[PDB]
């Protein structure tokens, strides 16, 4: 969907409607904690909207915004694996719950907004069909069409109250990651079907009208559902990581904005377990890694699929010179996420020169 850097446009409408919908649908028996957290959410509507649009304007975005795409119908032992729209929902959702728990509500809500940007995208027709703006003139055309008419596509209810099926189903599965993937898959498959049936360049103005109606309604309802899940999760301190093989680790790395803080050297993330086994991956995204001021995400798939988070005793990042000279690197902060939970939040704010290793854990 379209969005503007000031937190306006289709994406902002979707999150804004998401909140209104939830407000309308909230049953009387909902816990006080949920209502209290919803009011805090509403205090930070600006952030939610800005977050819902930001990934399109992130200076660090990948070349063809690959991570804004996801096909719902779809070597890793030593290299990071790329993010997808689905995986970014999970990443930002984890960051959001983490910040919420420590009362850092403005930043928490921004992250929630970013999670919803990606959900919004996988609920378009073009993104889950994996048809890019390069592939088809229809990509930009359809999103512009929707943007112009976004007002007439707003909805204000999911169609039932939160003590009913749609919403109760959302709370059933304590495994947020597993729930999010399949929940997102449903909406994405609908969007993709709508691409082929109504939204592609083969179709009419009437077809595009129906396509936008259904996918914008679904985007809003789907967003309301994620917000509901979020308010419940943060109200109860629900941990979806318990607990639970660590099949993947995600690193979320903030590079300092200081001069020459970024690097083009080889960069590795590694772990050592209590049993002294090691695994190390090169961090390399389909993009310009470790740019000054950037926030980079890397996902690492473990060789041992039966490890528990406690089993991981040491973590580090290691740099290796690309040229004969040291390209010193200065990370501000690294967060490691496992199974939907931020398990490491490590301020660094010091230089890593040459071929040095920095010990996180
Ligand atoms: Ca540097
Ligand atoms: Ca320089
Ligand atoms: Ca490389
Ligand atoms: Ca790269
Ligand atoms: Ca660079
Ligand atoms: Zn979009």
UniProtKB/Swiss-Prot annotation:
Changing residue 321 to E: Decreases toxin activity in vivo and against aggregated substrates in vitro. One of its GO terms (molecular function) is toxin activity. InterPro entries: PLAT/LH2_dom, PLAT/LH2_dom_sf, PLipase_C/P1_nuclease_dom_sf, PLPC/GPLD1, Zn_PLipaseC. Residues 238-246 are annotated as: Linker. The keyword Hydrolase applies. Keywords: Calcium, Cytolysis, Hemolysis, Hydrolase, Metal-binding, Secreted, Signal, Toxin, Virulence, Zinc. Vaccination of mice with a fragment (residues 275-398) protects them against a subsequent challenge with purified alpha-toxin. The protein is composed of 2 domains; the N-terminal domain contains the phospholipase C active site (PLC), in a cleft which is also occupied by the 3 zinc ions. The C-terminal domain is a putative phospholipid-recognition domain, which shows structural homology with phospholipid-binding C2-like domains from a range of eukaryotic proteins. The ability to bind membrane phospholipids in a Ca(2+) dependent manner and toxicity is conferred by this C-terminal domain, which also contributes to the sphingomyelinase activity. This is Phospholipase C.
């Amino acid at each position: 969907w379209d969005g503007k850097i000031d937190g306006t446009g289709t994406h902002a409408m979707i999150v804004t409607q998401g909140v209104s919908i939830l407000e309308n649908d909230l049953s009387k028996n909902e816990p006080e904690s949920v209502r209290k957290n919803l009011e805090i959410l509403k205090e930070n509507m600006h952030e939610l909207q800005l977050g819902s649009t930001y990934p399109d304007y992130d200076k660090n975005a990948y070349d063809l915004y690959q991570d804004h795409f996801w096909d719902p119908d779809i070597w890793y032992l030593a290299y990071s694996i790329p993010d997808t729209g689905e995986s970014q929902i999970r990443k930002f959702s984890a960051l959001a719950r983490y910040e919420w728990q420590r009362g850092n509500y403005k930043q928490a809500t921004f992250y929630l907004g970013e999670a919803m940007h990606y959900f919004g995208d996988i609920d378009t027709p073009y993104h889950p069909a994996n048809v890019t703006a390069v592939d088809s003139a229809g990509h930009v055309k359809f999103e512009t069409f929707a943007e112009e008419r976004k007002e007439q596509y707003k909805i204000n209810t999911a169609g039932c109250k939160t003590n009913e099926a749609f919403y109760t189903d959302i709370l059933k599965n304590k495994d947020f990651n597993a729930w999010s993937k399949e929940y997102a898959r449903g909406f994405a498959k609908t969007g993709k079907s709508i691409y082929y049936s109504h939204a592609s360049m083969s179709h009419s103005w009437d077809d595009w009208d129906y396509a936008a109606k259904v996918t914008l309604a679904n985007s809003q309802k789907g967003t309301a559902g994620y917000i509901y899940r979020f308010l419940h999760d943060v109200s109860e301190g629900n941990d979806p990581s318990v607990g639970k093989n660590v099949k993947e680790l995600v690193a979320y790395i903030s590079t300092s904005g200081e001069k020459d803080a970024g690097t083009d050297d080889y960069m590795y993330f590694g772990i050592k377990t209590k049993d002294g086994k090691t695994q190390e991956w090169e961090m390399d995204n389909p993009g310009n890694d470790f740019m000054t001021g950037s926030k980079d995400t890397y996902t690492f798939k473990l060789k041992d699929e039966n490890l528990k988070i406690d089993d991981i005793q040491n973590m580090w990042i290691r740099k290796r010179k690309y040229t004969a000279f040291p390209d010193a690197y200065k990370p501000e902060n690294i967060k490691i996420i496992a199974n939907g939970k931020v398990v490491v939040d490590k301020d660094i704010n010091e230089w890593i020169s040459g071929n040095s290793t920095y010990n996180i854990k």
